[PDB]
Amino acid sequence: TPDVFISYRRNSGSQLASLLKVHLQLHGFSVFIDVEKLEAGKFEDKLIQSVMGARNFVLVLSPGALDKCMQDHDCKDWVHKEIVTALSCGKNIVPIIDGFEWPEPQVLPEDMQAVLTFNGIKWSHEYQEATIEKIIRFLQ
Ligand SMILES: OC[C@H]1O[C@@H](O)[C@H](O)[C@@H]1O
Ligand SMILES: [Cl-]
């Protein structure tokens, strides 16, 4: 089972998610990211089970990353589902902020508003090694 699950918006956070994966693997963490570890079967169930298995939930907040979660009260959006799973399971949630604007809580479904209460890490292009070192300090 992975130490770290990486949750990301495919259309805007793919590159940072992949960069986080490489760095965390280099520092000895087992990482789940969909394009490497999601394999055959019903992907909804497999993705939720993979969130449940990982102690750490690394959430890539690229610009607009939570937009598709807004008004998604039937919880059809995959990132929304992954966040609710990490929250419900009491995972160590580590938001990574990359150009993301914090929305007002009331624009998000009630079942994920708590994600805004976790201490986040600002991604620094100019100081990436230091950013990675801070992420590692945050991981359990
Ligand atoms: O790929 C885009 C995001 O939703 C799911 O497909 C992945 O687990 C990732 O968090
Ligand atoms: Cl997505």
CB 115 within 8 A of CB 95: yes
**Ligand 1: nearest atom to the Cα of 6:** 10
Is 10 annotated as a binding-site member? Answer: yes
Instruction: Name the strands in the sheet holding 121-122, side by side, starting at the edge strand that comes first in the sequence.
Output: 31-32, 4-7, 56-61, 92-97, 121-122
Buried b (16+ CB within 10 A) or exposed e, 36-62: eeeeeeeeeeebbebbeebebbbbbbb
Give resolution in angstroms: 1.8
Find out whether 113 and 72 touch, Cβ atoms under 8 Å: no
Distance CA(102)–CA(51), nearest Å, equals: 23
Cβ(13)–Cβ(68) below 8 Å = no
User: Tokens 């805007």 — which residue?
Assistant: 12
Please indicate whether residue 82 is annotated as part of the active site: yes
Q: Whose CA is nearest to atom 5 of ligand 1?
A: 78
CA of 3 to the centre of ligand 1 (A): 17
Q: What are phi and psi of 4, to 5 degrees?
A: -140, 130
| Nearest ligand by distance to the CA of 64 | 2
Q: What 3-state DSSP class applies to 4?
A: strand
Token pair of 9 as six digits: 């918006």
Tell me the C-alpha distance between 106 and 83, whole Å. Answer: 16
Torsion sign, CA atoms 109, 88, 81, 24: positive
Q: Residue ranges per domain, the chain?
A: 1-140
Read off the DSSP letter of residue 110: G
- Contact between residue 82 and residue 69 where contact means Cβ atoms under 8 Å apart: no
Pocket test for ligand 1, best of 5, 6, 9 (most atoms within 8 A of CB): 9
Dihedrals φ, ψ of 93, to 5°? -90, 130
Q: Is residue 9 a known part of a binding site?
A: yes
Tokens representing residue 97 in the block: 């902020």
Please tell me the distance from the alpha carbon of residue 117 to that of residue 40, in angstroms, as a whole number. Answer: 35
Distance 72 CA to ligand 2 centre (A): 13
User: Is 36 assigned to a binding site?
Assistant: no
The end-to-end CA distance of the chain, in Å, is 14
